[PDB]
Amino acid sequence: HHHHMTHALDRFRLDGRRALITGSGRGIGLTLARGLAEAGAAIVINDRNEEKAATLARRFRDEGFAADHAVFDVAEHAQVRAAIDEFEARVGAIDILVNNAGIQRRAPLDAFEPDDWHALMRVNLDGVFNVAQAVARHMIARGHGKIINICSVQSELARPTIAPYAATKGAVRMLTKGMCADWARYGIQANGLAPGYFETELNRALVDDAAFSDWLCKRTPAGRWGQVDELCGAAIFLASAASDFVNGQTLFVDGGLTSAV
Amino acid sequence: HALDRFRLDGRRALITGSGRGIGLTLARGLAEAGAAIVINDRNEEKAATLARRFRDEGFAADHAVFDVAEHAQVRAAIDEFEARVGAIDILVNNAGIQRRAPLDAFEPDDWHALMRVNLDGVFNVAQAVARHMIARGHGKIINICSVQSELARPTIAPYAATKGAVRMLTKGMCADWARYGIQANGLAPGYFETELNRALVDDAAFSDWLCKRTPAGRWGQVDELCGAAIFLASAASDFVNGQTLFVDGGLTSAV
Amino acid sequence: MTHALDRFRLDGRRALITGSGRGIGLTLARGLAEAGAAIVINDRNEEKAATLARRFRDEGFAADHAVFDVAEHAQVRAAIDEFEARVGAIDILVNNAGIQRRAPLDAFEPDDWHALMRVNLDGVFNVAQAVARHMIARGHGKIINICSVQSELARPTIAPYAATKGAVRMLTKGMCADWARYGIQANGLAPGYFETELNRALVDDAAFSDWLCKRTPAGRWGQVDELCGAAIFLASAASDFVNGQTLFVDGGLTSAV
Amino acid sequence: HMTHALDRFRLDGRRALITGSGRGIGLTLARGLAEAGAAIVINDRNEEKAATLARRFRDEGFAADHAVFDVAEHAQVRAAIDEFEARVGAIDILVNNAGIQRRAPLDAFEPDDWHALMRVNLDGVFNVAQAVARHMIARGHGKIINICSVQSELARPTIAPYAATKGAVRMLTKGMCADWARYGIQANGLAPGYFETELNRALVDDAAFSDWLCKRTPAGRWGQVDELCGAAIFLASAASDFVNGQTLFVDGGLTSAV
Ligand SMILES: NC(=O)c1ccc[n+]([C@@H]2O[C@H](COP(=O)([O-])OP(=O)(O)OC[C@H]3O[C@@H](n4cnc5c(N)ncnc54)[C@H](OP(=O)(O)O)[C@@H]3O)[C@@H](O)[C@H]2O)c1
Numbered sequence A: 001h002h003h004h005m006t007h008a009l010d011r012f013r014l015d016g017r018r019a020l021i022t023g024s025g026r027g028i029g030l031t032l033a034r035g036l037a038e039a040g041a042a043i044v045i046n047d048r049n050e051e052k053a054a055t056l057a058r059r060f061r062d063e064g065f066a067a068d069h070a071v072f073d074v075a076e077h078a079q080v081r082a083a084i085d086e087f088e089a090r091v092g093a094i095d096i097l098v099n100n101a102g103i104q105r106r107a108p109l110d111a112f113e114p115d116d117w118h119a120l121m122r123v124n125l126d127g128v129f130n131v132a133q134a135v136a137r138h139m140i141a142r143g144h145g146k147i148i149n150i151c152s153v154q155s156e157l158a159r160p161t162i163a164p165y166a167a168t169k170g171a172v173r174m175l176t177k178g179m180c181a182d183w184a185r186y187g188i189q190a191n192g193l194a195p196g197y198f199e200t201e202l203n204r205a206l207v208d209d210a211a212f213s214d215w216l217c218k219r220t221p222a223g224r225w226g227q228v229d230e231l232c233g234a235a236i237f238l239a240s241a242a243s244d245f246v247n248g249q250t251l252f253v254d255g256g257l258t259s260a261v
Numbered sequence B: 001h002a003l004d005r006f007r008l009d010g011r012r013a014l015i016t017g018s019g020r021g022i023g024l025t026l027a028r029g030l031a032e033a034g035a036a037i038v039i040n041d042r043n044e045e046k047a048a049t050l051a052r053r054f055r056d057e058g059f060a061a062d063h064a065v066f067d068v069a070e071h072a073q074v075r076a077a078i079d080e081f082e083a084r085v086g087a088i089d090i091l092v093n094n095a096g097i098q099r100r101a102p103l104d105a106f107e108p109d110d111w112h113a114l115m116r117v118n119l120d121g122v123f124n125v126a127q128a129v130a131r132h133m134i135a136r137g138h139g140k141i142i143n144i145c146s147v148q149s150e151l152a153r154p155t156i157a158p159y160a161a162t163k164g165a166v167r168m169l170t171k172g173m174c175a176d177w178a179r180y181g182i183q184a185n186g187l188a189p190g191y192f193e194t195e196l197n198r199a200l201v202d203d204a205a206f207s208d209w210l211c212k213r214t215p216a217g218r219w220g221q222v223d224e225l226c227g228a229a230i231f232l233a234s235a236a237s238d239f240v241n242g243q244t245l246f247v248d249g250g251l252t253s254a255v
Numbered sequence C: 001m002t003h004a005l006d007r008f009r010l011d012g013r014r015a016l017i018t019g020s021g022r023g024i025g026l027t028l029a030r031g032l033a034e035a036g037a038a039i040v041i042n043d044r045n046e047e048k049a050a051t052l053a054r055r056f057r058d059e060g061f062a063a064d065h066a067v068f069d070v071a072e073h074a075q076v077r078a079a080i081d082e083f084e085a086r087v088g089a090i091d092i093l094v095n096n097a098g099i100q101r102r103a104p105l106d107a108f109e110p111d112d113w114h115a116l117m118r119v120n121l122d123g124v125f126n127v128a129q130a131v132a133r134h135m136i137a138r139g140h141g142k143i144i145n146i147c148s149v150q151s152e153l154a155r156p157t158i159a160p161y162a163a164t165k166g167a168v169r170m171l172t173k174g175m176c177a178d179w180a181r182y183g184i185q186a187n188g189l190a191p192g193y194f195e196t197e198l199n200r201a202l203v204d205d206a207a208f209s210d211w212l213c214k215r216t217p218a219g220r221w222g223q224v225d226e227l228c229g230a231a232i233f234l235a236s237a238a239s240d241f242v243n244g245q246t247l248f249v250d251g252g253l254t255s256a257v
Numbered sequence D: 001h002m003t004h005a006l007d008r009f010r011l012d013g014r015r016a017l018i019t020g021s022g023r024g025i026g027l028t029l030a031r032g033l034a035e036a037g038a039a040i041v042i043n044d045r046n047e048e049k050a051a052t053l054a055r056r057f058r059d060e061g062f063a064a065d066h067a068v069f070d071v072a073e074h075a076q077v078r079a080a081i082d083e084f085e086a087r088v089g090a091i092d093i094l095v096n097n098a099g100i101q102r103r104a105p106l107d108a109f110e111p112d113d114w115h116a117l118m119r120v121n122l123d124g125v126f127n128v129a130q131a132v133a134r135h136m137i138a139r140g141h142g143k144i145i146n147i148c149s150v151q152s153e154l155a156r157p158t159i160a161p162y163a164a165t166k167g168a169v170r171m172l173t174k175g176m177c178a179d180w181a182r183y184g185i186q187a188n189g190l191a192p193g194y195f196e197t198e199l200n201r202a203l204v205d206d207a208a209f210s211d212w213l214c215k216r217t218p219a220g221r222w223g224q225v226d227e228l229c230g231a232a233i234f235l236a237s238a239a240s241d242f243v244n245g246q247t248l249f250v251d252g253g254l255t256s257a258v
């Protein structure tokens, strides 16, 4: 007689949406690209290397996903705009942007090399502006879009030797609020996704350091490293209609680290 | 099967103060995601009849009667429910009240009433349920916060104190209970048309101010809170702990 | 040519410090008196408060006392109104009285929950409301609410205390929202870790101290005199455009993982 | 008593460098710090402006010198700081004040304006803090005060890139604390609300903005620049020796309220 229905849960589906993930040739970006595709999105692989991005997109199509690619260095403003505009003209609309590309360089701030400072600013901060601006012109024209900026625990709490990275991630957290202030009126939700400590290549030296890992497990209420699949749920949520009234916020996925001494 | 990340099959959610308002909306949303739900009201006939209407709509639904402000009464009702109906795996601490006046004019009875419902009540129900969640080694606790967990508005300083308290109490639940497989998080709504906010909805000047103050340019609609609640109740948020997620159309991110 | 520095002087101002019979409150009372304030010692014990005020006077300070339990709303209001009329205006309020009770939240006794709420949260409301009525009417006043690291970051076994201190941090913003228009600056002062009787169990535990020193960028416990500068600043004209804020004095603890 | 209490805040025997102190908040803070007893160093990109101001402070009875550099030029800053330390002496207090503002909706924002903001407001803080901190760390004491903004916390339309720079500076401040508190450095932020300087000329001249601001601010008014001196002296003095990694907002209540 009765029929159980699922309206509030169905709003998590991404069917009919296209997501571009910057730096999705490997790492968290590739993990999130697959998670968003599984949730129904067409995806766009981004890498600086054309052959790599095109081949990865083809492997997604072999698995039945809708996938394409867009080649650019996020730090190159004009190059990014040309690639985004060409993709919109030839392929179609980008409805979700995940600003994932990023790098890490560790040293005490008094010894930090200026070239390392500059490289971090170009990728982690200039890059987020370059791709968001280029995509947002098209989202504004359509009156809807999602922008998800990958942040960090260092958007809130500092650690020794990574002061420049923390500067870039505090910048992205505020740039996210600024995207909301300028674009919420056009139906765009711009939010931050801040992972805690995840076992990945960016952090391999930390994972392999027994002293650091012992400290991290005591420091984190959850008592462990995160694993990258644990970010997919948050990314899907922020990309979906289920979060249409979430805007300007940064969601920390860190096992409780930022909530505790 | 990507939606499976967010499904609540086999879990039961209790929503305090779910006879009307946001609590009723969240109960429906969690049930649609697959949870069995528990209606809470201080009036047994109202709670039980609402649960019956959920069951008529194909949802698994029961009820539990208590005033969240009464510590021993809550514990007795939660323990009785756990023994007679079954495990509560998700707790939404939603019951709350509002009383507005400049702080220099605030009546101590109103101060006390806000503290009892919005702050004691979160402790009373969370402690009673968490004893059982700890024994099972898993649970979700979602505490309903507010914009006033972060930004103050004139005439609601005592409410803001309760919602700042609940935001920190949420971090404290994580600190004590993450080791037992419990994730405790806050969900802070912006502005929604419920009876809590009747005076604001009916004030054209306030509504005009709110639409300019909110980047999204409008009031929220209560169903826009279900996604965040389902996320924080599901395995999709198992590595989210001690956080408060604001669902406010951008209000707290902007001047 | 010292204008900007004379903005820290408190001459001509009177400061009430709740719970100033011992601990941080007594330290802050002395610090404010040294900066020129007349001070009011508060304790629940009439003889203790009277003795402390007399000894401050013996050292050349202007001091009086006002006896009340911060948790008792009517008793606080009566004592504040009586003092305002008999002795004179209170221009600075330091809401310092507070308690701590530690236990895992699932075992927390409701009597201990209630005690923490009554002192740490009701108490701040009770004294702030009573004093602010007078300050608002005069058009000037400073309210300084003593917060904690637990206004922002939790620690196991002190979730109820954290609730009270998160409440006080937001109540501070609400005081600003209602009262800044009347010339009141209401701000929070959040100490990090200090060796008072509040924290005796922590001071006495070398493993806790080892954790704290490694957790704190400054690498040490604070010393209670290191709180006086912040209190004088927030009590003085030097902070007339600071409002609704909570200043953490914690050696960097809350800024770091 | 009074000597003991004011002693907390006195800056006698200390030297403060204020970047971009040719005008605006930086010049006001330079005067406030000198009034509290500090020897001061005026910084401007133009030698004749910095030299003239430093002489004017000396004519008024203050100890004052000048150091010319563009905060955005890493190697130039390093050479200028090291030369000042070698020839004149220790810099004990650094106020990273130099900054600019460029306003446009983000989708129309010019890359040249984005880059200008990053170079001054973010690179510049790194460039001068690194150069000075090397000396402070070696001595085992120092104060760094980074000028932030309401936009270190709350966004406003048309200034998203500036907000990015000020969120960056707020976190960089925490990073300075994490790396250098162990060496006796206190690094903190001072975030002004709204003040009538040339930075904000377009806002002062916009009656609708001013109307909005006075309603938005619990204090109900613009700040006056002298209201920032107290916070700067506090963060430069012994009174703040256990304050580290924090950003103090001086904004009349703005960031605390809806
Ligand atoms: N625990 C964590 O790992 C963690 C925690 C918090 C935040 N995050 C953030 O998560 C994001 C992804 O990090 P990850 O851990 O996946 O690091 P990763 O394994 O090192 O991957 C970084 C990705 O960014 C790409 N990339 C770098 N510079 C680029 C540029 N100029 N243009 C285009 N793509 C570029 C890389 O491509 P190439 O192969 O060409 O190098 C790679 O695909 C970053 O923003 C990082 O800050 C990570």
Ligand SMILES: NC(=O)c1ccc[n+]([C@@H]2O[C@H](COP(=O)([O-])OP(=O)(O)OC[C@H]3O[C@@H](n4cnc5c(N)ncnc54)[C@H](OP(=O)(O)O)[C@@H]3O)[C@@H](O)[C@H]2O)c1
Binding pocket: B016, B017, B018, B019, B020, B021, B022, B023, B040, B041, B042, B066, B067, B068, B069, B093, B094, B095, B096, B097, B117, B144, B145, B146, B147, B188, B189, B190, B191, B192, B193, B194, B195, B196, B197
């Ligand atoms: N825009 C918004 O509405 C908004 C924004 C931010 C936060 N919130 C929060 O959302 C929650 C729900 O509020 P609402 O807007 O839905 O308000 P509402 O329509 O007034 O509903 C409040 C609910 O709580 C119940 N309740 C009150 N005191 C209770 C007690 N002692 N024991 C048990 N139940 C009790 C009420 O039951 P009765 O029918 O018996 O009165 C009612 O079901 C509250 O925590 C509120 O602070 C709301």
Ligand SMILES: NC(=O)c1ccc[n+]([C@@H]2O[C@H](COP(=O)([O-])OP(=O)(O)OC[C@H]3O[C@@H](n4cnc5c(N)ncnc54)[C@H](OP(=O)(O)O)[C@@H]3O)[C@@H](O)[C@H]2O)c1
Binding pocket: C018, C019, C020, C021, C022, C023, C024, C025, C042, C043, C044, C068, C069, C070, C071, C095, C096, C097, C098, C099, C119, C146, C147, C148, C149, C190, C191, C192, C193, C194, C195, C196, C197, C198, C199
């Ligand atoms: N590291 C720290 O010590 C630390 C850190 C952060 C925040 N704090 C805060 O700093 C404040 C002072 O704490 P403390 O460290 O100085 O603690 P303490 O040594 O235990 O002193 C607490 C003071 O409050 C008084 N008090 C307690 N309940 C009272 C009541 N009902 N009415 C009036 N006075 C009452 C006590 O008087 P009796 O002698 O009658 O008990 C005593 O003078 C508290 O708000 C505390 O939360 C302390």
Ligand SMILES: NC(=O)c1ccc[n+]([C@@H]2O[C@H](COP(=O)([O-])OP(=O)(O)OC[C@H]3O[C@@H](n4cnc5c(N)ncnc54)[C@H](OP(=O)(O)O)[C@@H]3O)[C@@H](O)[C@H]2O)c1
Binding pocket: D019, D020, D021, D022, D023, D024, D025, D026, D043, D044, D045, D069, D070, D071, D072, D096, D097, D098, D099, D100, D120, D124, D147, D148, D149, D150, D191, D192, D193, D194, D195, D196, D197, D198, D199, D200
């Ligand atoms: N309400 C406010 O005014 C307000 C609010 C919040 C934060 N702030 C911050 O306060 C600081 C001072 O701003 P303000 O209001 O005083 O602005 P202002 O009147 O425009 O002054 C800015 C100062 O920085 C200097 N400067 C700019 N770029 C420089 C560079 N590359 N190298 C060296 N000096 C440089 C300027 O020198 P020139 O004379 O050569 O241009 C000028 O002396 C900035 O960091 C600003 O973001 C201001």
